[PDB]
Enzyme design. Sequence first.
Site, short mmCIF file in Angstrom:
data_model
loop_
_atom_site.label_atom_id
_atom_site.label_comp_id
_atom_site.label_asym_id
_atom_site.label_seq_id
_atom_site.Cartn_x
_atom_site.Cartn_y
_atom_site.Cartn_z
N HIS A 103 0.81 -1.23 0.00
CA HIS A 103 0.00 0.00 0.00
C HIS A 103 0.83 1.26 0.00
O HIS A 103 0.41 2.28 0.55
CB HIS A 103 -0.97 0.06 1.18
CG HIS A 103 -1.89 -1.11 1.25
ND1 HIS A 103 -3.19 -1.05 0.79
CD2 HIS A 103 -1.70 -2.36 1.71
CE1 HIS A 103 -3.76 -2.22 0.97
NE2 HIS A 103 -2.88 -3.03 1.54
N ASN A 119 -10.35 -3.02 2.84
CA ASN A 119 -10.06 -3.05 1.40
C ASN A 119 -11.36 -2.75 0.66
O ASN A 119 -12.43 -2.74 1.29
CB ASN A 119 -9.61 -4.46 0.96
CG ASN A 119 -8.12 -4.75 1.17
OD1 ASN A 119 -7.28 -3.84 1.30
ND2 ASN A 119 -7.78 -6.04 1.17
C1 HDD Z 1 1.02 -10.11 8.19
C2 HDD Z 1 1.08 -9.35 7.11
C3 HDD Z 1 -0.22 -8.68 6.63
C4 HDD Z 1 -1.35 -9.25 6.18
C5 HDD Z 1 -1.71 -10.76 6.22
C6 HDD Z 1 -2.28 -8.17 5.89
N1 HDD Z 1 -1.59 -6.98 6.04
FE1 HDD Z 1 -2.29 -5.10 5.72
N2 HDD Z 1 -0.30 -4.31 5.97
C7 HDD Z 1 0.72 -5.02 6.58
C8 HDD Z 1 0.68 -6.37 6.82
C9 HDD Z 1 -0.33 -7.25 6.50
C10 HDD Z 1 1.81 -4.13 6.96
C11 HDD Z 1 3.16 -4.63 6.37
O1 HDD Z 1 1.97 -4.14 8.40
C12 HDD Z 1 1.36 -2.75 6.48
C13 HDD Z 1 2.27 -1.99 5.49
C14 HDD Z 1 2.36 -0.60 6.10
C15 HDD Z 1 1.63 -0.68 7.40
O2 HDD Z 1 1.47 0.28 8.17
O3 HDD Z 1 1.13 -1.91 7.56
C16 HDD Z 1 0.05 -2.97 5.87
C17 HDD Z 1 -0.76 -2.02 5.28
C18 HDD Z 1 -2.08 -2.15 4.96
C19 HDD Z 1 -2.94 -1.07 4.52
C20 HDD Z 1 -2.47 0.38 4.35
C21 HDD Z 1 -2.80 1.24 5.56
C22 HDD Z 1 -2.41 2.63 5.14
O4 HDD Z 1 -3.13 3.21 4.29
O5 HDD Z 1 -1.37 3.13 5.65
C23 HDD Z 1 -4.17 -1.54 4.31
C24 HDD Z 1 -5.42 -0.77 3.83
C25 HDD Z 1 -4.13 -2.96 4.60
N3 HDD Z 1 -2.83 -3.30 4.98
C26 HDD Z 1 -5.20 -3.82 4.49
C27 HDD Z 1 -5.15 -5.18 4.70
C28 HDD Z 1 -6.26 -6.09 4.55
C29 HDD Z 1 -7.72 -5.64 4.27
C30 HDD Z 1 -5.82 -7.33 4.83
C31 HDD Z 1 -6.59 -8.68 4.84
C32 HDD Z 1 -7.88 -8.76 5.19
C33 HDD Z 1 -4.40 -7.25 5.09
N4 HDD Z 1 -4.03 -5.91 5.00
C34 HDD Z 1 -3.57 -8.30 5.43
#
Ligand code: HDD
Lengths: 688, 688, 230
Positions: C63, C136
């Site tokens: 993202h 999402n």
């Molecule tokens: C274990 C890893 C993992 C998994 C399985 C998911 N995510 Fe996540 N996501 C992350 C690990 C992550 C992260 C690496 O922790 C991020 C990247 C930057 C942050 O702040 O969190 C992130 C960012 C992130 C963002 C951006 C937030 C922003 O605008 O700053 C969104 C909208 C989502 N995720 C949504 C989801 C959805 C709807 C998931 C499943 C239902 C999902 N992610 C599964």
Amino acid sequence: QQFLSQFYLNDQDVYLTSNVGGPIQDENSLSAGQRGATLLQDFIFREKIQRFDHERVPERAVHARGTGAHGTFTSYGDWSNLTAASFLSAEGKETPMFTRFSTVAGSRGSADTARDVHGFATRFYTDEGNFDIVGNNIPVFFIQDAILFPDLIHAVKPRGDNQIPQAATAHDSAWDFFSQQPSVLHTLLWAMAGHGIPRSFRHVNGFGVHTFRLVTDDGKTKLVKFHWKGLQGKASFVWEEAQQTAGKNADFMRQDLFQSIQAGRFPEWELGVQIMQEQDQLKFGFDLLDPTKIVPEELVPVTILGKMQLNRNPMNYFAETEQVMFQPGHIVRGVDFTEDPLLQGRLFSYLDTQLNRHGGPNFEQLPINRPRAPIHNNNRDGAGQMFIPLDPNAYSPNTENKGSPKQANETVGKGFFTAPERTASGKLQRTLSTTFENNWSQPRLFWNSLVNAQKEFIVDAMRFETSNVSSSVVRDDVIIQLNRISDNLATRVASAIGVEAPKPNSSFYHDNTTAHIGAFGEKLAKLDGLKVGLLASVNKPASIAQGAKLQVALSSVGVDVVVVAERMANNVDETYSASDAVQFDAVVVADGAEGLFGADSFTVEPSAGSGASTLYPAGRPLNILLDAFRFGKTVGALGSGSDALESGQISSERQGVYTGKNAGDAFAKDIKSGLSTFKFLDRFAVDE
Amino acid sequence: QQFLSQFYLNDQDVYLTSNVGGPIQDENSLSAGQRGATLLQDFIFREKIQRFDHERVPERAVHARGTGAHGTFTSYGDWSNLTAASFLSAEGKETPMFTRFSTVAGSRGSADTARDVHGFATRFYTDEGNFDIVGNNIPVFFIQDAILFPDLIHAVKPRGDNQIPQAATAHDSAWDFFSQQPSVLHTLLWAMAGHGIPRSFRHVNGFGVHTFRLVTDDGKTKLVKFHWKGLQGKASFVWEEAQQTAGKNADFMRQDLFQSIQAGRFPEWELGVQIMQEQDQLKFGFDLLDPTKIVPEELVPVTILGKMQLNRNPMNYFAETEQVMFQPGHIVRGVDFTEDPLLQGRLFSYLDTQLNRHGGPNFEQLPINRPRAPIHNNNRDGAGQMFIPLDPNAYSPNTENKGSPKQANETVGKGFFTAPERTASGKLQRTLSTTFENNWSQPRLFWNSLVNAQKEFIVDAMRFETSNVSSSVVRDDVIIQLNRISDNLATRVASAIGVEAPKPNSSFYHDNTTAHIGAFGEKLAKLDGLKVGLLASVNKPASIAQGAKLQVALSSVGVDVVVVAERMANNVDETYSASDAVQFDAVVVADGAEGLFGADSFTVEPSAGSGASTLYPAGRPLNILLDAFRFGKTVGALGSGSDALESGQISSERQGVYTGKNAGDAFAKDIKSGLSTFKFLDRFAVDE
Amino acid sequence: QQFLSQFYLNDQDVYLTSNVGGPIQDENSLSAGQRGATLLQDFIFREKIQRFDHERVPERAVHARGTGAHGTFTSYGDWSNLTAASFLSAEGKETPMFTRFSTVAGSRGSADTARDVHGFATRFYTDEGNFDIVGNNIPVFFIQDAILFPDLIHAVKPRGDNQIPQAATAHDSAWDFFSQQPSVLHTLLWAMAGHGIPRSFRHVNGFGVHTFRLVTDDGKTKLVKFHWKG
Ligand code: HDD
Ligand code: HDD
Ligand code: HDD
Ligand SMILES: *[C@@H]1O[C@H](CO)[C@@H](O)[C@H](O)[C@H]1NC(C)=O
Ligand SMILES: *[C@@H]1O[C@H](CO)[C@@H](O)[C@H](O)[C@H]1NC(C)=O
Ligand SMILES: *[C@@H]1O[C@H](CO)[C@@H](O)[C@H](O)[C@H]1NC(C)=O
Ligand SMILES: *[C@@H]1O[C@H](CO)[C@@H](O)[C@H](O)[C@H]1NC(C)=O
Ligand SMILES: *[C@@H]1O[C@H](CO)[C@@H](O)[C@H](O)[C@H]1NC(C)=O
Ligand SMILES: *[C@@H]1O[C@H](CO)[C@@H](O)[C@H](O)[C@H]1NC(C)=O
Ligand SMILES: [Ca+2]
Ligand SMILES: [Ca+2]
Ligand SMILES: [Ca+2]
Ligand SMILES: [Ca+2]
Ligand SMILES: [Ca+2]
């Protein structure tokens, strides 16, 4: 690939392990029961996710979007009468290299074909230390003092409130800065010309921009400009074609370089210097210390020193290309700086910025940044210390380590030394040198030297860009500055953007030229890696077979023929759905494919009895042909394929349109001619 | 050393270079003229100072003060019926190790001899992954849930406002926490006993604290406690002696270890386990999951598995010792966790905290942290990526890399596996287990088991510490809690600190004991690295000669004789000025040195004709003698040296005071007997 | 804006200062003479360029490409029989919000209109703590266990050797993963439909994806899916 191979991780036919070598599985979290919560004690889960969570590092503050390759430098001579630099000390002496090419403004996922200045950074891993020339594809830069860099970059980068627009100078702040700081005008003209939108990294030249010093062992100096003269030839897009490429293939230029090297079509540049005397600094009517000025090759020719060949792709992009950390401060004995205030400040920035990227002081220990020469010093510790120094007495002077490491200087141990006759004189001051004040004569020189079509491309680029500038104040200031270069330029731009045509201001007008300075007007030297799209049809198998026939005739000049058809079949390379004119340097309609090119194909209602295809969007084949023509590309047709030209209202009487009975040698000859011309400039309107 | 040697930098007889291999000099900044300003283009200056500016990394959040050594483990057997752990799979199998010892509370540069719990962290570099046992010199810890760690540590560490006191529990907040959280009482008694102030890291045992599981290839489990049984013997200071050491030699314990290894006196520990069944978790009258409880050796004996020897000092302290990053999550097939809530939460902390220390995710790539086993996984990138992964398809399941790396589990590829019969049952909850509630019976067990003098040392420590507690509320609360352990203990402490003697509360009083649990009461097994200070005089050369004579008699038991005199002369090791009782395990007055020990030497006026030396402070020789006696050390005198005993009013009939005619075998035998006893406990008063 | 305004720096009609309040000029380096070398003692130069050199922070691991706006939530009711959540405790109760929308795969500076799943992350700054629903524009996700995330993301992101292609699943590794891990098929169909290429962030719905619990003060629970209906 001797040196770096010690760092390779080979993961073929092995069991998965943790980062500390314990065999593991990694597909299911540890849960309390079949449908239960995940346990904190699942160290496998946490180590895997933690590495992922921390994969990213800050992108480069500028040149974030780039691509790299390994190569080799070969010296053409013993240059010891010119420089003490070890890599130039003998005819045939070879030195490993790494090179990274880039744009400037865009972030790391921005399009390759944005209009911008381009980076051209070359590392020599010499036997007396890493030496980096951190250059551009344009020989002059926007500003005359490094302290103005954050101003320039904040102005060209996206707005502070909304981060719009990406990788574009087509907004108020950029043109506000250009018009408030007329030193920018020379580089601006280069970037608005073909040089802002090159066809590939193989089809540009490189420049060190600054005047440097070469120094012999006995302390004698010459002033030089560094050149990288490309052996492929200059090739550039038109703007509408660059935009279309950005939408279809953001990776167009990185893909071109990668594929050329994989195919064994190694691009080459010759390293050259313009050799001048210390006494020449002010002799030519401008200051050699001024990075907004070129030395025309009519005044000082380029002396060729050797050749770089890029011949190996990285194995892992992140480890090699993302992590490479260039510095102009990576200098070797035999080279010295000059008092160019742009160069002077650069030296600070590149050492400091790696602390941001690497997160600590030991960035020179990364495999790609390591030297191929011994390291012996009293530097110690820091996060990420990958060495174990055996000497516990890390200071000079010492007796506890018997006086080692020993000082190296001009006369002992081949030390670096500053050119011994350099002097300082005058009051400490924060001023603009009076010698830097002519911002307009050289832009006019560049303007005078272009073919008419390229003058028009500059006009069209500025019309496009400044029509996106909302401020009337900025638009007017721009026209006033352009008018000091050329009243013709200013008038032609003003007419599109609602600014009154200015009266001539002739202070800096002149008729002088310098040869072959534009991106357009010369034929290509090599056709390696150029692509011919053969538009075929699976319904007429003989059309597809013309691909192999055309390929055999074009193989020897390194040109690829790409067979396009409705669906993947034998000998089909790609589908119409996945194709676009921008993928090809020439487009040929195969004999028997003409039925796909109906003049009504764009708008026909897809009724059952229309028998319209679902295999590609309405009018795709004709669109590829017409785009190719409009963009100025070589277009061709074989046999009955010429019917497609009629459908598109393309006359075979036009330059760069070729017809042939079959895919023989006679047709390949025409295509080779077309490809070497590269772009047919008579398809572009010029102001009268 | 075969593995680590690839990272060594040898700086013997070499020229100085930059970090990128360019020869340089580094002794003068580049200036504009002889007396001018320093130039920004001096990259030599900036690279040197940047490395310096960034040398430091955060100290460990706890155990900041520590030292390490390399060693090797030998298995005494094939333990495959007990555990699948590879390093225990064959009699005589050897595994390289690294071990770090530490205090807990003090920062970097705090005294070695602060009163504290001590770390005992041992890494096995096994052929199936790194395995760390991250232990302490005390078998029980203060708290029962990891979530309380910041509370405990904030209470023990210096005040938040002024950061006082360093490396000490002798302040209100510590004793406030101890008295509010009675789980702390057992560890508190160990720390207030001799175990809080050991003589050296060679003279302690180690403990894993937690109950772990051992697991066979077929999934059978035992519950175990890990023990490191020291082969040198337990030796500890008294408090006033530990304090004086902190003033004279902050590095006392780290010096002891370094010198012992350099002298080839390699300290050894045997690894043992108390082996129990899954069904034994509650049947002993306490919970095996409770880390505040010991399993008395009377109930479950220690089974010895193998032996660790420490036999090599680091080459560079920062690279090896400072950067080693232990984790209880560094576990191997054949070992598993238990539901001990302190252990459970530890697993999170040690992976997270390395991000702070290293500044990025790739800390397992530091030489000292790398495994001696292959790494194969799909983890990628991160700052400080020192590898180049060849597989561009870093995901499972894949066909693009032919399904590799392959999953390893219980049955294939020797994967780690969680003990298959472990189960979860019950409501999700944030509670203290009802099985964890007896905070007082085991502290009483420990108390009962000590010799009288060590009971007194606990009392004296608590009197000292709580006399420094300002809050009356805290002092009172402490006495209430101590009273639940023993009314004797409580009353004896109360009397020093102005708290009314409490009435007995007999709920937890009992008379059970466990054998040899204290730091005092047993003779040393080995005398290796103990030091005899021979107090001599340059004015009587024969006194100095006794040193060599005594040394020859003691060399076979690994004891060093240190000759102390007024000034450096032949065969003199140290001067009186640079000497103190705390440097020596025994002090002997040489024949002919007695004149230096006059009873009036402390206070006589140093007038011209008085003869008094300027070579050492007034009374120094007698001070060393009297301190050695008061601290409980072996004291001796040879020939007329016995006059010094008379001057200090030390009667030779006292235990641990020895006299002889000359330094022969008879006297040496007496000194060895004294050193084996180590401390003479009859010199300390005990409550009546 | 009452809260955030305390952090505002207003630079209208003011003199230039250093970061520590000293008035300065910043247009020329300090040189030894008119055409001389730049001096190390030029602290104005070094503070300015150091700030510049360190402007960047790592982009989000996924993202990375996104945009945000401030807003406000209004509760339509007293939902205390369904949840103890303070921000839903009264009809007409208002709570400040911040929302970020995004694609998933592309880096910073990749195109908004790449085909992808889209983020829909909403923060409520409630009087009882920040509450984030990180959602999402599609109600289902590709995988069934978080431990598979790096596998999914490594497969979808550019090749490891050459970092091609940007912001695209149209390459071997992505479809290798999708076909090896059939859990991905539902989300795949949503992304290949119009939901992968919306007209704007205003013209999508949002979803929490997961089942959550709502819990009353007395511990009664419901299972819920969260929806943001555009
Ligand atoms: C274990 C890893 C993992 C998994 C399985 C998911 N995510 Fe996540 N996501 C992350 C690990 C992550 C992260 C690496 O922790 C991020 C990247 C930057 C942050 O702040 O969190 C992130 C960012 C992130 C963002 C951006 C937030 C922003 O605008 O700053 C969104 C909208 C989502 N995720 C949504 C989801 C959805 C709807 C998931 C499943 C239902 C999902 N992610 C599964
Ligand atoms: C004082 C600021 C400053 C100024 C005046 C310049 N640069 Fe620079 N440049 C940096 C500050 C910087 C930097 C912030 O230090 C970067 C970003 C990443 C890095 O390693 O250095 C960089 C990167 C960078 C790169 C990318 C290297 C790579 O591929 O990793 C190139 C090719 C150039 N620059 C080229 C130039 C040229 C030809 C300049 C003028 C003649 C120039 N820069 C002036
Ligand atoms: C949840 C917090 C927590 C708790 C409850 C414990 N520890 Fe821990 N410990 C850490 C959190 C931590 C840490 C913050 O993660 C450290 C600091 C530096 C490091 O690498 O880990 C650490 C370091 C550390 C070290 C130093 C390792 C070295 O020499 O580098 C030792 C010997 C121990 N601990 C021992 C123990 C023992 C025997 C514990 C109880 C039985 C214990 N710790 C509980
Ligand atoms: C350099 O010049 C010297 C003196 O003129 C002469 O010996 C020779 O021709 C030159 N050497 C090289 C390296 O070409
Ligand atoms: C270089 O170092 C040598 C050895 O110390 C010394 O004799 C010489 O004068 C130094 N300086 C120069 C400029 O050569
Ligand atoms: C393991 O147990 C079996 C059966 O009790 C025994 O025969 C065998 O000797 C044991 N293995 C070892 C290495 O002690
Ligand atoms: C381990 O993996 C193998 C091969 O994939 C599989 O057949 C087996 O079920 C697994 N074993 C256990 C005990 O989970
Ligand atoms: C000692 O411990 C045993 C077992 O817990 C207990 O039954 C007994 O009462 C204790 N005896 C004493 C001396 O208090
Ligand atoms: C909650 O439930 C009770 C009992 O069913 C009802 O009387 C009350 O109105 C409800 N509260 C709200 C705010 O709806
Ligand atoms: Ca200047
Ligand atoms: Ca023609
Ligand atoms: Ca609990
Ligand atoms: Ca004293
Ligand atoms: Ca005696």
